[PDB]
Structures are given as structure tokens and as C-alpha cells.
Structure 1
Amino acid sequence: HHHHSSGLVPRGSHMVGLIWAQATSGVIGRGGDIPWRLPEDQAHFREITMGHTIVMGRRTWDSLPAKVRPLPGRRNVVLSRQADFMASGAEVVGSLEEALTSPETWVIGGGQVYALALPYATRCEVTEVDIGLPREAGDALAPVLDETWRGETGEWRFSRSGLRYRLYSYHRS
């Protein structure tokens, strides 16, 4: 239960990580949008994901502005159960199993997909945003991590955007 894992990824393996930003309450989205824009979090998301495959749910793809998607520098994969859903510039697949063919994959949202992917994941990179944002019916929420996960929490930091935030890194075998 406490064996070490390495950060080096052999090319024959399939490392699955989750990356998300949440308010303390666990909200990650409402009404199809992320309710903040922190430049430190945006930079961090790129630094982690650049050069890898990114997997997202169909609703997260829908929420990206048409002009910015697919996100550059990364293989974009969108999960949909709809046989007629298409994503220009990206691959649409019908299962998580089909999406996880690369050696390093970052699941980048949203609520449903994080839940679905967790069982396969060995890394989570979390940004906590210190914004008063209550959970409302219909909100997209973050996954909750059990005791199989070990992690490190950074100190509270202060965004140029005027909100406090802090970074968590979690891993498991």
C-alpha cells in the first residue's frame, strides 16, 4: 500500500493523470463555464499538459471557444456516446478505454469524465481557488480522493487576479 512510484514514464506504459481547478466547495463549473480565470492556474495547466494527450468530455469540448479548440501542442481526444458528434481538429472516441492509448494522458474535465477516469489514474494535479462559491444543483463537481492517494499541499498563494489559490499534487501506485 505504500510503494514508491516514479515520475519517469516508460513509453510502453499508460500513465493517466487528472488535472482540475476547484473552489473549496468542490465546484469546478457552472452553466458550462469555469467561474474564474487565474493566470497562474492557466499557465500551470499548460505546463503540465503540453506535449501530451488531453482527454475531455464532450461538454467540456463544447465549452471551449470554437476559435481556441483544439488546444494546441497536445493531442485532443473528446469522449462522446453520440455516434454523430464530431469535433473538428480532434478525435472523438466512445470510451475511456479507447482514449487511453498514449503513454501519458491528462484528463482535463469535466465532472463526469473525472469520475470515470479516476479508477485508472495515478496522478492528480489540483488547484484550489479561495472563492466563495456554493454548490448548486447542476454544478459540475470535483472528484474526492480516498486514502489510496498520497499528496502534497502547497501554501496559500496570491493570484494577480486577486484571489488566493494553492496547488495540490497527489499520486498513487
Structure 2
Amino acid sequence: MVGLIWAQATSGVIGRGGDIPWRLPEDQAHFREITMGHTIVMGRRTWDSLPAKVRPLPGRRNVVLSRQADFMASGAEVVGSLEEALTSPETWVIGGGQVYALALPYATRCEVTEVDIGLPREAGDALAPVLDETWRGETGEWRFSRSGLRYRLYSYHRS
């Protein structure tokens, strides 16, 4: 099973300046629950965004996509193509924009946290992938995060 998991503003922005312009603890907890124990695949730019003290993310097989044959990611496996990372029962692609678009053909699940933040898209932003009509979505109820922003969870699925 290949799944994608991400949080986006209502505009579709997922990242800016190489980081993320919000932080919802409830989203962090949902991310940990869904990914724990499984393979996580991230792009090199996303690995670079994690502080060394928190990486690799515990209890998961950390995999980083890079075109650099000598790039070293301490605590992770570095692979030059996405297909080499798909050897577990369950694989979660955790970002960022480039790797979501690369992995979408392999994916059957999309776990989306929509953040109710008014964040118009700007040049250089990373964006969530566009989901065509093959994806069936089940929407959650708008919830309040202790950070003060509302959020809702989406579960998209396709055979």
C-alpha cells in the first residue's frame, strides 16, 4: 500500500521557504499515529528541514530520495529512485511537493489535514498534489486546534 500524508492550507500550500507556516499538535499526533511502524519516504529537501536531534523519526524506516549518489542521511537510507523504497507492506510518503507528485501514481491512500488558514499561493511555495476523479474522498468535521486554527481531516482512497 502506498499512501501520501500531508497538511495544507485551504489554498493548497504545504510549505514555504523550506519549512511550514503553521504547527498543529493535533496534526502532529495524527501524523505519528498513521506513520508509526511503517516506511516513511521523504525528499532530500524535507530531510534537510528536520533538525538532527529529531531525525530519524523513531520507530519507522526513514528513506530519503536524492539524486546525489554520495548524499548521507544519518539514520536513514538514501535512494536514487522511489521504486527502491516500496519493499514494506505499508509505505507513507511524507513530503515534500516534488515527492508527492512523483509518488501519486503509486498511491492508493491520501491522508490530508486541511488547515483553515488564509495563505494565498506564492512563487516558490510547495503545493499539495492535484487529485483526479479516480480518488474518492471522505471529509471530516472541522475541529479546533489548540493552536487556534480550525482543521479537518480528509481520507482519500482509490483501488
TM-score by length of structure 1 reads 0.91
Deviation at 1:108, TM superposition (A): 0.2
Tell me, which stretches of 5 or more residues in structure 1 are unaligned? Answer: 1-14
Tell me, which stretches of 5 or more residues in structure 2 are unaligned? Answer: none
Moved over 4 A (4+): none
CA distance, structure 2, for counterparts of residue 95 and residue 112 of structure 1: 13
CA distance, structure 2, for counterparts of residue 16 and residue 53 of structure 1: 10
Deviation at 1:38, TM superposition (A): 0.3
SS in structure 2 at match of 1:77: strand
Q: 2:19 aligns with which of 33, 39, 46?
A: 33
Count of residues paired in the alignment? 159
What percentage of aligned pairs have identical amino acids? Answer: 100
Report the counterpart of residue 112 of structure 1 in structure 2. Answer: 98
Describe the superposition over 1:98-119 as per-residue Cα deviations: whole angstroms up to 9, x where unpaired. Answer: 1111110000000000000000
Describe the superposition over 1:17-61 as per-residue Cα deviations: whole angstroms up to 9, x where unpaired. Answer: 000000000000000101111011000000000000000000000
Describe the superposition over 1:76-101 as per-residue Cα deviations: whole angstroms up to 9, x where unpaired. Answer: 00000111211001000000111111
CA distance, structure 2, for counterparts of residue 143 and residue 66 of structure 1: 28
CA distance, structure 1, for counterparts of residue 23 and residue 125 of structure 2: 17
SS in structure 1 at match of 2:104: helix
CA distance, structure 2, for counterparts of residue 121 and residue 89 of structure 1: 25
Q: 1:123 aligns with which of 109, 112, 120?
A: 109
SS in structure 2 at match of 1:168: strand
Structure with larger Rg:
1
CA distance, structure 2, for counterparts of residue 36 and residue 72 of structure 1: 22
Report the RMSD for the aligned CA atoms in angstroms: 0.5
CA distance, structure 2, for counterparts of residue 116 and residue 30 of structure 1: 19
Q: 2:132 aligns with which of 146, 156, 165?
A: 146
